[PDB]
Design an enzyme around this catalytic site. Sequence first.
Site, mmCIF file in Angstrom:
data_model
loop_
_atom_site.group_PDB
_atom_site.id
_atom_site.type_symbol
_atom_site.label_atom_id
_atom_site.label_comp_id
_atom_site.label_asym_id
_atom_site.label_seq_id
_atom_site.Cartn_x
_atom_site.Cartn_y
_atom_site.Cartn_z
ATOM 1 N N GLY B 50 0.790 -1.230 0.000
ATOM 2 C CA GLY B 50 0.000 0.000 0.000
ATOM 3 C C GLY B 50 0.807 1.257 0.000
ATOM 4 O O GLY B 50 1.951 1.180 0.303
ATOM 5 N N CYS B 81 6.630 -5.248 0.317
ATOM 6 C CA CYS B 81 6.610 -3.834 0.526
ATOM 7 C C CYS B 81 5.959 -3.444 1.809
ATOM 8 O O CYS B 81 6.256 -3.935 2.865
ATOM 9 C CB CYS B 81 5.935 -3.069 -0.537
ATOM 10 N N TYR B 82 5.033 -2.549 1.743
ATOM 11 C CA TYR B 82 4.416 -2.163 2.963
ATOM 12 C C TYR B 82 3.936 -3.253 3.862
ATOM 13 O O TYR B 82 3.903 -3.080 5.055
ATOM 14 C CB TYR B 82 3.247 -1.304 2.644
ATOM 15 N N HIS B 188 9.415 -4.148 -5.190
ATOM 16 C CA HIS B 188 8.204 -4.837 -5.633
ATOM 17 C C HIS B 188 8.504 -6.062 -6.490
ATOM 18 O O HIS B 188 8.699 -5.939 -7.704
ATOM 19 C CB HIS B 188 7.279 -3.881 -6.396
ATOM 20 N N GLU B 190 6.379 -8.295 -6.994
ATOM 21 C CA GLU B 190 5.113 -8.528 -7.645
ATOM 22 C C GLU B 190 4.914 -7.646 -8.815
ATOM 23 O O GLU B 190 4.181 -6.728 -8.789
ATOM 24 C CB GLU B 190 4.037 -8.316 -6.598
ATOM 25 N N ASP B 242 -14.667 -11.150 -24.101
ATOM 26 C CA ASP B 242 -14.790 -12.286 -23.265
ATOM 27 C C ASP B 242 -16.028 -12.997 -23.687
ATOM 28 O O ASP B 242 -16.081 -14.195 -23.666
ATOM 29 C CB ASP B 242 -14.879 -11.878 -21.819
ATOM 30 N N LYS B 345 -7.206 -11.827 -18.793
ATOM 31 C CA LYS B 345 -7.330 -11.416 -20.207
ATOM 32 C C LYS B 345 -6.202 -11.685 -21.152
ATOM 33 O O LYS B 345 -6.391 -11.954 -22.312
ATOM 34 C CB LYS B 345 -7.673 -9.941 -20.327
#
Lengths: 520, 480
Positions: B50, B81-82, B188, B190, B242, B345
């Site tokens: 965050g 991280c946070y 990060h 991620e 989709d 997606k």
Amino acid sequence: EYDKILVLNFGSQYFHLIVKRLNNIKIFSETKDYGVELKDIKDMNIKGVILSGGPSVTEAGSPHLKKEVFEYFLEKKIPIFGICYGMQEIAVQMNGEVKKSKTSEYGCTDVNILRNDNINNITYCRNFGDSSSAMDLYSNYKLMNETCCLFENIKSDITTVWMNHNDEVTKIPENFYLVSSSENCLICSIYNKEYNIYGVQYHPEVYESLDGELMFYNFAYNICKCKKQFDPIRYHELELKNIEKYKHDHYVIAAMSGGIDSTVAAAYTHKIFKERFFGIFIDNGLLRKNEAENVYTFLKSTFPDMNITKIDASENFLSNLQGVTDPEQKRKIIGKLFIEEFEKAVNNIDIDINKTFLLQGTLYPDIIESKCSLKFKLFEPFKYLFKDDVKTLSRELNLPEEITNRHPFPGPGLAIRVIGEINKHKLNILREVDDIFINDLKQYGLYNQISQAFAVLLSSKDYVCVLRAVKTSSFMTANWYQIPYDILDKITTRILSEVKGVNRILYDVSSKPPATIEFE
Amino acid sequence: ILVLNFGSQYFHLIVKRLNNIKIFSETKDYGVELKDIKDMNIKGVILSGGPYSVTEAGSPHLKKEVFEYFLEKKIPIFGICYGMQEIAVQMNGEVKKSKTSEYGCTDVNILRNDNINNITYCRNFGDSSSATCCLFENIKSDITTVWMNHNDEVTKIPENFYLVSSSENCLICSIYNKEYNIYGVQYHPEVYESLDGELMFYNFAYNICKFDPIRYHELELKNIEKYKHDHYVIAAMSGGIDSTVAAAYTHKIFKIDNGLLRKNEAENVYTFLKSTFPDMNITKIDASENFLSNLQGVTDPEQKRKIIGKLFIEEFEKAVNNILYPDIIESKCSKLFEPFKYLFKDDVKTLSRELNLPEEITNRHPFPGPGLAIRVIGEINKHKLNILREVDDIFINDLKQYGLYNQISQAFAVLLSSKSYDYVCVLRAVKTSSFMTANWYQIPYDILDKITTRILSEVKGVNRILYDVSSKPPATIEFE
């Protein structure tokens, strides 16, 4: 009279350019509106007439001359010129005919003078008729010799013209000869020696046609002598030595707002004429943050004591327009208030009512719109110079580097740039972001290169302010400057992150004119 | 595995990268409470990054009680991280302000004793100072590279936690514990940028895995297809990519308008349905003059959408009468069946071209929702719509042809009314990054000049047109 050239405008938005080279050439200009009666010509010596139009004439009701005017204009020894629409009108008001052109392209256009030998240089006769021999269409039209009077020392046979035509002429009024060929516009200009008429459907009104200034030069200079004209700069100067002879006995007013037109006039009007003139500053309620004071400060610093007044007056205006959408209404209003505040300011010093000559920030053009579609004998100093020439004058006075590069201000200021409720808080906020944007912009040096930058507002209801930028070739042309993404991501981010109250920023891209020079 | 939501955008890209490997997930907000966990388990926990600094308010207040239970659970932990900052704080240690910080391109260095001796970047660390984690077992490569987003320099650590790494101008940037296999990562991992990050999740991940997405949905779909009582179409094929994909597979194995849309694009649209749908239905309800009407001076926002919405519940019923993963994720952490969710997606894109689909299944801007209610200035009239549709299309026309159009993640136009007659516009350009962010990309100047000149030249009713320059965050993508 001793007057010299007449230049009718049928919507010719390069009218300025006509006047400028008429002047740069050391020559006299005069103006009018097309539907100009001969009622206001004065029996004044006029050795040249010029007509210009570039607003079709294929739709009933388009503008052009009146016969009395044309015939008088023709005379015998007094010349006629036509240009774009002027030519067409020239052409149609005397046995010619006209038809819409097809996909005209204009542009800096090399173009070619035309003599028979050039009958064949043409390498573009394939179009607009038949076959190949260059000679056939030429055989069809009139022609002649290489040396043309209106063309001398071109150095190069080819002529360039930056031009626009959405309409072209199809028949040769009367009897004059062919002098120009265009890819998609074949006849072009035709030069008449007994009617002294020389129609160009191109635009010699530009700097994109240097050989063009030449044509203009030549035309006055040759078709008509214009032996001695009048020099403009010298003019601010003589109105001036003439006024220096009586400084002490005569009072004077200035209309200062920081506009370069203004500081310059005053200062050149201040020397040898120091204690009698009251510049007065009227707050508009709509300034660039602390612009009022920065402006006053500059003035004091330039020169110490010229009786400087300072009148602050914001709320009357805001109140005056609490929530009005009319736009022209807004102009009317602001004008009215400055006129009133100016009257009261001048009159806060109760004396010498009719021994004062207001000065104004006026060069050539405003004086020019004077004819388009208390009170003291006036004395606007600059009635013949162009913003650019005045810009060179600003260095000529050696004033600061900062002023010449001023985005002239609109007048209504932020009101028009403010399109919504106009009030003290929101407005304060954008004078402010306008500042964030202008500072970053100027931080990288685009100020001197950005003709004109102004965050302008939009009342989304939190709020989104749209940013405007314009490259100014001149008064009627306004192309829009781009700003690189690096600078822009930062500016933009800065503003949203930094100024509370805005949720979306747009940047306006619409070009040219489209002269939404300010939104309202 | 449990994920804790604290709002970083990458916070869902977190889950997407993790999903590749056999993986698993459930969702919750900062205070995931304990009534939210039972006969429930995972072997590791993923903290949520965050932008709220802990020594600063809004830092989400992690339930300390829950934290206690989390430790009590007996399972390895992973804090990013946070998640790290909050976590440090539950513990004795604490942070501090940005150390001449930044985000991203930064290249982290690793440490140890040999490697300890190895740090030539402790300078400027106090006037002037000098000098194989579970996390990096196989890159092994001793180093680390990644996208970093720390505003929050953590300066002093918790308790008994040594460091697997340090970095240039960020000192503490890894925390390795043996107390609970804890780790806090200031950079990060991620993200896609973190190639070594990939294995963090995998290894910590495996170390936390004492199934595969496509695998699972392929399976559920077939089973769903096992009984084959299927005459029930799952949902209307409004044309969404989709949609066409799901509809296609299912309908293929086994035997919607008005609201908006652009123009002939529309005709083209049912037309598309037909070529696509060789032998399938293309129901339609071209009648939306009513609601448009109901839009002749009324602009309530929750309501403009809610309206189009009951408008829509309306269409379901009228047609009825004649007879993916990220979205769900945003809903969970935030506070006839969907055919499948174990996919995103990008992957469905590969599925389309893995199922031999027509081109243009990818470069399409699905302005889901109001087909176009948002771009209503306030009043709703046919004139505006048509003009707008025209301009939007001129707008996508130019990009399709110039080649940047598939370059752009999402392009259209909004119809402003504050511009002799007049109305004016915005041109939207957003090269997205994520679901919880979008960043706008510059479109080039000469080409932009022409697109504008072309729009300027086609109609009246648009006095000045304006490009839009806003990246999310700060403000959102659909202008209204």
